[PDB]
Amino acid sequence: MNIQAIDTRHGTANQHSFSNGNCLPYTGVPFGMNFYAPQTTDQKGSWWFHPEDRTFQGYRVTHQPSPWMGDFSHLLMTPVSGSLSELSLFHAQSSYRPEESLFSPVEINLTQLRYQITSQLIPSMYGGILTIDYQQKDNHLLLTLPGRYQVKQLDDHQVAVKVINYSGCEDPDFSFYFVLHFEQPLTKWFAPSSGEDGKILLSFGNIAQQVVHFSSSFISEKQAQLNLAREISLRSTEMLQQGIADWHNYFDRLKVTHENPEHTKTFYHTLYRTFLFPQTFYELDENQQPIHYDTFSQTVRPGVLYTNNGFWDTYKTVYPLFSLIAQEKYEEMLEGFLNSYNETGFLPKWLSPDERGLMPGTLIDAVIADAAVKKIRPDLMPQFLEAMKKGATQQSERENYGRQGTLDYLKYGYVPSTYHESVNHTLDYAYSDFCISQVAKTLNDSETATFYRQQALNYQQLFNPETGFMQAKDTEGNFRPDFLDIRWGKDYAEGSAWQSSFAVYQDFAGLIKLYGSELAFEKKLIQLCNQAPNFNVEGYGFEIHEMSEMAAIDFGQLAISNQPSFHYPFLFSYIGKPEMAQPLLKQLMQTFDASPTGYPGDEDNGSMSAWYIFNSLGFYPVTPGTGEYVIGMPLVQTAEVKLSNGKQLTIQTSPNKVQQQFIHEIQLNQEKHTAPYFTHQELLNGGTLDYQLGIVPNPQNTAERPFSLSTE
C-alpha cells in the first residue's frame, strides 16, 4: 500500500476507561526523533487528541509514546489570523472538519474554520516544513512553549526556542531546542526572553502564504541550526518525496496480499506503527558522527541512543521482527542500549526519555539473548553479559533501575509476597536468568551458563499444585490464602492468575510436568479459553481498562488486549496439538482493523502491531532467545519477505478464505515440514514457504516440540 493512503487516526479513539490502541496520529519518518500530531483538547491530560473532536488547538511536536508515560520536550505551533483575546490554547482554538482533513504518516493537511487558514506539515527526521495558506490579512503563528522556556529572534527570518518539559527525567533541566526559519520575514521584532508556559505570537503581516522550515535538537541551539541547514533548501514537495521513500524502504520489505483487501489495509496500518519506535535519540555532529544527550550526567556524548521503549512490551514481537527484516536497525539500537548501560550503570527498562523504571522485569535481557543466538552484534555480547550479570546480582540504590528485590530473589529463589506484583517479578527474573544463560552459552562461558540455567527454573517456586496457578508466596514459603483465580492485581500486573501463570517461555515442558502431563495442561488451556471473561477487581479496588477490554469480547481469559496473553494460542503447540488453536488465531486476528477503534487494547510502541504482522505470516516468536518461531495460522495469501541477509522468503497459501481455519500441510522449499516451529536459520535460507490450508484439521501428531530447558 502507498504510505499516503495510511490514515494515522487508526487506533486513536480512546479514553482513560477503554483502549482501542491508545495510539496518537503520529506524522513522522520511521524512527523519527520527533513526531507531529494535531492537538484537539488540553482538557483531558494525555488524551490530547480524539478523532471525533472538531476542535483544533495546534500542531503538537511530541515525544509521547503512550498516555501512561506522558510527553517530554513538546510544544505547539498554531496558525492564527486577526487579533487574539488572550493567547491560551482555548482562546486560539478553531473548529475544523475531520472528514475534509488529511492525516497520513508523511503529511497533515487541515483547514481552521475560524481563521480560514489551510496548513500542511511534512516531517523529516529532525524537523519538517509547515506551509500556511492565509485568506485573511493579519497573519501569525502562535508558539506554545510549555514548562520553562527561552526564546530569541536570530534575525528577521529566524527564531530559536528552548523548552524544558517532561513527565519524568534524570536531568531536571532537560532541554529541547527548536529553530524556525520563515520564508516571509517577521514584521514585528522581539528581544530575548524567558519564563514558564510561554505563548509567543509571531507576526508576518498580510502575506498569502508562509513557509516554515523547522528543526530541533537535544544537543544545543547550534546543533539545531546545523540540523536545519542540512535541509533548509528542500521544497515541501521534495521533503514529502523523501519521507515517502523512507517509509517505502520498510514497506517494500513485506509485500503481502489477502483474499479480503480490508485485511491488507489492516496489515499496512499495523506496519506503519511497527517502524515508529524506538525513536532516534541521537544527532549527527559537524563530522557526521553520532552524538546524544546523556541525562544521567547531563552531558553531550558521542554514539547512538534510542528512546521511547518499554522492553516489557517490545521484546515480545518488535525486536524478533527486526531480526528478520530490519537487522541494520536492531544492530544500531543494541549499541544505543549498551550506551544507556554505560551511562547509568543498568540496562534500561523503560526509556522516556531516560529510565522511568515502569513495569516488572528486565526484558531487555530477552532482546539481548535473541540477538546473541541470532548472531546479531556478537561483538557487543561480552559487554552485554557483564551488564546482565550486574542487573541479576546488584540492587540499585536508585529505585527505577535494575531488578527490584534482587537480593530477596537470590535469598529465597523468588520475590516474596511483600513486594507488589511479586509473581510477575519472579517469573520475569527466571526468564531473564534463561536469557543470561543463552548469552553465556554463545560465549562458551560454561560456569555462567550452568548457574543461570538453574536459576531459570525458579518459576517452580510459585507453582501451587493445589490450584494449578502461580501464586505469591511469603518468606516462610506459604501461599497467600483466599486465592481466587479471576482476582486481578496485587500479586499480578494488569491481570489475574489466568493472565500470569504461563509466563514460562524458557521451559513450557517443565511447566507441563508440574501439571502432571500434557493432557492435564491441555485441560487447563481449554478451561482458560472456553469460560466467560469474568474478573474480580479486589487487587485494584476498581475496574481498569485492561479488564474492560477482555470483558468486551467473548475470548475467555485469553486477554489479547494485553501483552501477557499474546503467546497463549501457541501453548497448544507445546502439547503437540497446534490444530486446536489454528481457528482461534484466525479469529483473534479479526479483532484488528484499520479504523480508529482498530486494536483490541494498547498498541504499546509496535508491540501489538508486530503481533499482528507475525500472525499474518503464520509464525510467532514465543521464546525470544531460542531462535525459533512457533507456527500458527497465516492470514495472508502471499508475502514476499526481504530478509536482512539479502535473501527473499516467498510465502504462498492455497486460497485463504473465511472457511480456511487450519493448516493442512506445510512445504518449505518443496519439503514437507512437520515440526510445530521454524528455526531462524531455516527462514533466513529464503526460498518458498507454502501453506496448504484446510477447512478441517490435519493433526500431524508430531513428537517434536518447540524449545524447553528441561528437554533440550
For the bound state, the minimum distance from the C-beta of residue 552 to K ion, rounded and expressed in Å, comes to 7
Nearest by Cα to 352 from 27, 589, 9, 65: 65
Q: How many helices (H) and strands (E) does the chain have?
A: 18, 34
* Partner whose footprint covers residue 20, from Ca ion, K ion, none (CB < 5 to 8 Å by kind): K ion
Alpha helices in 214-273 (DSSP H): 221-229, 236-251, 261-272
Element (H, E) at 463: strand 463-464
Report the residue closest to K ion, judged by CB: 20
Element (H, E) at 80: strand 75-81
For the bound state, the minimum distance from the C-beta of residue 610 to Ca ion, rounded and expressed in Å, comes to 13
Shorter beta-carbon distance to K ion: residue 507 or 603: 603
Shorter beta-carbon distance to K ion: residue 597 or 692: 597
* Partner whose footprint covers residue 342, from Ca ion, K ion, none (CB < 5 to 8 Å by kind): none
**Helix 607-617 crosses helix 582-589 at what angle (to 10 degrees)?**
130
Binding characters for K ion, 92-121, by CB under 5 A (x = yes): ------------------------------
Alpha helices in 326-421 (DSSP H): 327-344, 364-373, 381-393, 406-412
| Bridge partners (DSSP) listed for residue 128 | 123, 214
Report the residue closest to Ca ion, judged by CB: 602
By CB under 5 A, which span of 63-71, 351-359, 475-483, 594-602 interacts with K ion?
594-602
Shorter beta-carbon distance to K ion: residue 22 or 626: 22
For the bound state, the minimum distance from the C-beta of residue 439 to Ca ion, rounded and expressed in Å, comes to 27
* Partner whose footprint covers residue 41, from Ca ion, K ion, none (CB < 5 to 8 Å by kind): none
Q: Is 407 exposed, middle or buried (0-12, 13-18, 19+ CB in 10 A)?
A: exposed
548 contributes a contact to K ion by CB under 5 A: no
For the bound state, the minimum distance from the C-beta of residue 598 to Ca ion, rounded and expressed in Å, comes to 16
| 139-155 vs 127-134, strand pairing mode | unpaired
**Helix 607-617 crosses helix 318-325 at what angle (to 10 degrees)?**
50
Is the Cβ–Cβ distance between 212 and 236 less than 8 Å?
A: no
Nearest by Cα to 615 from 270, 294, 298, 340: 270
Kindly list the residues in this chain that would bind Ca ion in the complex (CB under 5 A): 562, 602, 604
- Buried b or exposed e, range 156-179, using 16+ CB within 10 angstroms: eebbbbbbbbbbbbbbeebbbbbb
**CA distances to 282, 307, 341 from 294, in Å:** 10, 12, 11
Shorter beta-carbon distance to Ca ion: residue 47 or 483: 47
20 contributes a contact to K ion by CB under 5 A: yes
Q: How far, in whole angstroms, is CA 191 from its chain's centroid?
A: 42
By CB under 5 A, which span of 206-214, 553-561, 580-588, 589-597 interacts with K ion?
589-597
For the bound state, the minimum distance from the C-beta of residue 351 to Ca ion, rounded and expressed in Å, comes to 16
CA atoms within 13 A on the CB side of 312: 23
Shorter beta-carbon distance to K ion: residue 51 or 290: 51
For the bound state, the minimum distance from the C-beta of residue 492 to K ion, rounded and expressed in Å, comes to 23
* Partner whose footprint covers residue 109, from K ion, Ca ion, none (CB < 5 to 8 Å by kind): none
For the bound state, the minimum distance from the C-beta of residue 555 to K ion, rounded and expressed in Å, comes to 12
For the bound state, the minimum distance from the C-beta of residue 212 to Ca ion, rounded and expressed in Å, comes to 37
- Judged by CB under 5 A, the chain residues 596 through 655 that form the site for K ion are 597
* Partner whose footprint covers residue 549, from Ca ion, K ion, none (CB < 5 to 8 Å by kind): none
Shorter beta-carbon distance to Ca ion: residue 16 or 157: 16
Is 604 annotated as ligand-binding? yes
Is 227 annotated as ligand-binding? no
What single DSSP character describes residue 5? G
Question: Can you tell me the distance from the alpha carbon of 380 to that of 75, in angstroms, rounded to the nearest whole number?
Answer: 37
* Partner whose footprint covers residue 602, from K ion, Ca ion, none (CB < 5 to 8 Å by kind): Ca ion
Q: Is 4 exposed, middle or buried (0-12, 13-18, 19+ CB in 10 A)?
A: middle
For the bound state, the minimum distance from the C-beta of residue 19 to K ion, rounded and expressed in Å, comes to 8
Residues of the chain with a following break (C to N over 2.5 Å): none
Binding characters for K ion, 397-436, by CB under 5 A (x = yes): ----------------------------------------
* Partner whose footprint covers residue 597, from Ca ion, K ion, none (CB < 5 to 8 Å by kind): K ion
Using CB under 5 A, list all residues that contact K ion: 20, 597
Enumerate the known binding-site residues for Ca(2+).
Answer: 562, 604
Binding site: residue ranges? Answer: 562, 604
